[PDB]
Design a protein around this ligand. Structure first.
Ligand SMILES: N[C@@H](CCC(=O)N[C@@H](CS)C(=O)NCC(=O)O)C(=O)O
Ligand SMILES: N[C@@H](CCC(=O)N[C@@H](CS)C(=O)NCC(=O)O)C(=O)O
Lengths: 198, 198
């Protein structure tokens, strides 16, 4: 009956959900997933998928929106259309654009994609996206979507954690560094991010 | 002051916004975009981006959520957390997973990516995703997220339109065909989808 979260902890998309549950003080049961039993839940064969008293849901960014909508307060995921859109914008950018930019460099330098040119190119594309994000963080001076922690800081925070947790010569993005150090005081970030969880 | 939509009409992501505006009876000004003037609006250099009385927003799936939240009724984008999550799920699946699966085949067969193996492989991956979607449409027997038209049917409907508008030997997905014929009676689909707009 209680919330079940299916998917291995190393998955960044699974940790979006785990960290959100910590923010919400929502109890859960987590299960490692790399099978019809699973495909019955998520026909795409990807992690995470949740079960919430009979309600089955996949897509990590959808799942965090759902848990926020059901259990969370307004600050976490604001109802006002413009404020909500700023939060959605960075969630959607994380899930469709930013996460694609790191593939070669992450799989190559962290997960062991060993072509020097390909890695250099991924770092280049990742850098250009991190450049956009760094500029936003300078502009707010605080969190990704404004002056306080929101749902967007979960996908964005984990993605910045991934950037610093990938071994290469990092270009100076001071605002990104400020941001990750600010998130590091949060219980969920200590558990599901940091160098231990690239 | 009125809604400005920047981005060329052939873009599927731009047409998500154009079709939604038709559903909402929301007046707009559309401008073709393929430049600092643009990057000031969307630092990613992608289309679409909107301007709404000073409020600037990019990410097509974020933009359609925003316009729905601001101007639309509950049926279009329900407030109830589970119903809302079903809508978000397919929007997020469209924007992160399904749209990636067609790249090789679309660029090759529609936009002129001419490698026979690569095209066959894209068709394979596109087919497996369309297989998931077809199964969902069988399950509801109506629209992607349930018994009535929702925001999710805009990204999903345009994506199904793309599948049928791409010249190759299509595997039988009857429910997908039923669905696209159901959407074809909608004004926005006549304008921004069909064979004229793959
Ligand atoms: N759209 C899916 C993406 C899932 C996906 O494509 N890959 C998973 C593994 S199944 C992932 O976590 N990739 C990121 C990583 O390398 O940690 C979601 O966000 O839930
Ligand atoms: N995440 C962006 C995606 C934009 C993107 O990456 N490409 C645009 C062109 S700038 C597109 O519409 N691609 C689909 C197509 O081939 O029509 C959004 O949804 O707004």
């Amino acid at each position: 009956s209680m919330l079940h979260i299916l998917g291995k902890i190393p998955s960044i998309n699974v940790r979006k959900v785990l960290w959100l549950c910590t923010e919400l003080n929502l109890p859960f049961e987590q299960e490692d997933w790399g099978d019809p039993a699973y495909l019955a839940l998520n026909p795409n064969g990807l992690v995470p998928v949740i079960k919430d008293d009979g309600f089955v849901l996949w897509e990590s960014n959808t799942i965090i929106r759902y848990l926020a909508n059901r259990y969370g307060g307004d600050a976490l995921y604001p109802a006002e259309p413009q404020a909500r859109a700023r939060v959605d914008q960075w969630i959607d950018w994380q899930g469709s654009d930013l996460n694609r930019s790191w593939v070669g460099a992450f799989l190559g330098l962290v997960r062991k994609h060993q072509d020097p040119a390909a890695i250099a190119q991924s770092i280049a594309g990742w850098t250009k996206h991190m450049q956009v994000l760094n500029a936003q963080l300078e502009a707010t001076g605080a969190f990704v979507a404004g002056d306080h922690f929101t749902l967007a800081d979960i996908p964005i925070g984990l993605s910045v954690n991934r950037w610093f947790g990938t071994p290469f010569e990092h270009p100076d993005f001071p605002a990104a560094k400020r941001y990750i150090e600010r998130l590091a005081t949060r219980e969920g970030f200590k558990q599901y991010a940091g160098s231990a969880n690239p």
